[PDB]
Symmetry: C3
């Protein structure tokens, strides 16, 4: 049966960008092949130079977004090079059995493996490393990403009518727990292993020291802001592998939102803010109607503005005064 | 086009009360005019006299509830008197563009401005102050409220049938982060500015010192309890601009609930408790069936009973033994 | 009217098991009689011997699951033996009036009472002790459980078609706040009363020291894992009386999920993880398709793996390679 299926190899792209794919499937079920390389690396997460030993899928935090269609087979080649120091694996929330694949993918530095699973349910799902006994430690070190399983006929609105996006972005939100000295200064370590004992005590406080988009404070800002034009339909996938978040587009809305990200359910309309539970990926669809800068944030504003959970959208186009206008500009009175 | 529209000025009322309005629109689209005055003031929040420098819209925490209909134009005159010390603005989650209006409404002490926006989506939304760089500080100092955009044909149930409330109340929930000394005593400051540096360090712990309804511990109790009679249909709007809450009416239910508050979606039925994400306003509709006192609470009971997130309903009427009865009153055995 | 109704006494079973009942009602409305005995007892909650003074309904944490049908009358005899030291009561979220029954059920050591209420709404609900002034203290000491009110025609899917489970399990999740000394060691007390003053200060930090299933770290593991076979339809009821949780079955899904647990609403499909708000009971229905061990967890992985919110499912049957297979087992390369 599988022997007879067509196969296509797909090369992944770095978040927030997403690899080329078709929304509506033009071919029948296939075996979609991906290759990921694990990379343990030092990463600077804020403006003051705080450094951590990130554990990554393909060198990025979050790991890249994989896109397939319902009933396709995902075939993953996972490589853990001998330059790493720890055992890693991968658990797909999109998959059925063997702890999401985690029990079949344990690779020590110098090993590789290939797992295949059938994508039987449509929706956006989280995938993350989950080694027996060090689970929260690898996840909160940035070792998580997401896979999107599209219905073969693409997205549909509350009424069964087609929804087609023009642009798609992947925002992976990460909660970090950096150990601190008595005064509150962040600690630095030589290897991932040296940090372990302190990492555990920092996580048990349940209070993140940083909560960021795309791996660092300000990663999605300035020259890195997400871009769009008035009139474009944008799909924004957002994942949080460990902790709850409440995304919100300032100056905009979630016209159609699957907060818990499963496409067999109808979307919620006109959301101001939506809750994505820790361990879940969600998707929001919006059509831009006004140009300018928009801030995309986790709506606990302390987590957004003090901790790092803020990004930008820079949108081009003509201003519409019907929707909004300054009748009297700020003046003395 | 707007030139030709009828206009009506509306005078706001203090929470938990709501200004007079029609559920079902009897007129066509209009320009609804509101005036809000910013007031920075000291506020005592608990029984022991803890004081803070509240930043308010119209002198209350939360700011008043505005009520309009879908496709009406909201025209707001915002005044920041010279007696204030800080720059303020306003971002409406109900609006499209310019950061919810925040980028068009920056007023220093002594200034005013008038913003107009079209209410294109029906639902209850949060509005809050959002000055560049001091966002969480103004919000958690009480500078937030809500606007309700009613469908022109009013509320409907899961089946499209009309829902008409007899009473409506606005409960604004506020998380406060009061700085503390080494022993745990709350600090006091001369001006809002003196508190700033400590405010920031208190917010980063992410642990509120108080979580209250209508600005203070016990504000909605005793002589201030919300009132109703058996048989009345009550709509309770609840907002949390920064943090998640889970409202619950003890001894009652949410017969129809829009947890994320957007009226184009059908309501959830028979809720015991519902989650309102930080940065969102929700609405619950209930018909009283038994008389007595009811406690309306945030269902994390520590936040409710230790931190201040508890209010009361005092309901008049006849007891129904079919629904409930004490078969054997507490006695020795 | 009630005089004329048939009556049936039901003997409760210890969680995670559930007493015998019919899914589809074969009789007309009845008066279902239950007896619960309060028991204050010392309980060891972790591997290192941490002990607490648990306050329980029937000797277990959580209290047992009660199962009735919509429009049946629940008649509860509640006994607080003279061996206890504190006043207790019971508030049913399933009931209408008198604070869920809390104001009608106050019993001091040596007393008993019998409350009757009509189960007018279908769904899974929480019940918990709620004495005026010590509410969070009795709840977080383990004094809560759940009642399931089944529609008279049983469960239905998103389309109105019947859903029949083969097995049902009750998982009660508990957040504990154990007082600590200066170094971080947990304190021990002689009586519940001696712990009170410190209990309050520990709860106000809002940071649980333990979060467990069925009363202890590892209670649902090893020889205590939940069991099933490939092909069985399992209903898992989960409750959290005080704090939010996000259940997730590793290697599986929630095929039909009522996150806020009210059966008049259609279920959400294909959930990876779902949010159950503090003060609520939810239910997830799943059909096992692969054999092996599954971990059932609260998906904030720090709360799961460091704090105790993890249990197991041991499923028998044949492996299906179509759904998943190890193409290349971990090897050197
Ligand atoms: O929409 N300003 O958080
Ligand atoms: O319903 N007592 O939290
Ligand atoms: O599905 N491993 O949390
Ligand atoms: Cu890893
Ligand atoms: Cu997981
Ligand atoms: Cu302000
Ligand atoms: Cu906002
Ligand atoms: Cu009790
Ligand atoms: Cu309760």
């Amino acid at each position: 049966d599988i022997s007879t299926l067509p196969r296509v190899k797909v090369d992944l792209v770095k978040p927030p960008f997403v690899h080329a794919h078709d929304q509506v499937a033009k071919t029948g079920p296939r075996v979609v092949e991906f290759t990921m390389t694990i990379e343990e690396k030092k990463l600077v997460i804020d403006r003051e130079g705080t450094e951590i030993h990130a554990m990554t899928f393909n060198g990025s935090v979050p790991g890249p977004l994989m896109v397939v269609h319902e009933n396709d087979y995902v075939e993953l080649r996972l490589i853990n090079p001998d330059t790493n120091t720890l055992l890693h694996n991968i658990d797909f929330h999109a998959a059925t059995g063997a702890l999401g694949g985690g029990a079949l993918t344990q690779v020590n530095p110098g090993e590789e493996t290939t797992l295949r699973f059938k994508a039987t349910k449509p929706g956006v799902f989280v995938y993350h490393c989950a080694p027996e006994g060090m689970v929260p430690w690898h996840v909160t070190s940035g070792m998580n990403g997401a896979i999107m399983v599209l219905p073969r006929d693409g997205l549909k609105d509350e009424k069964g009518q087609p929804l087609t996006y023009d642009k798609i972005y992947y925002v992976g939100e990460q909660d970090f727990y950096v150990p601190k000295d008595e005064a509150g200064n962040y600690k630095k370590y030589e290897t991932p292993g040296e940090a372990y004992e302190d990492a555990v005590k920092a996580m048990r406080t349940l209070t993140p020291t940083h909560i960021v988009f795309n791996g660092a404070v300000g990663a999605l800002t300035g020259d890195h802001a997400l871009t769009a034009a008035v009139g474009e339909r944008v799909l924004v996938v957002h994942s949080q592998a460990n902790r709850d978040t409440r995304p919100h587009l300032i100056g905009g809305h979630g016209d159609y939102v699957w907060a818990t990200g499963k496409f067999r359910n109808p979307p919620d309309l006109d959301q101001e803010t939506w809750l994505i539970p820790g361990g879940t990926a969600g998707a929001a669809f919006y059509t831009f109607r006004q140009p300018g800068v928009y801030a995309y944030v986790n709506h606990n504003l302390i987590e957004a503005f003090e901790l790092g959970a803020a990004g930008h959208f820079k949108v081009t186009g003509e201003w519409n005064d019907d929707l909004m206008t300054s009748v009297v500009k700020p003046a003395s009175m």
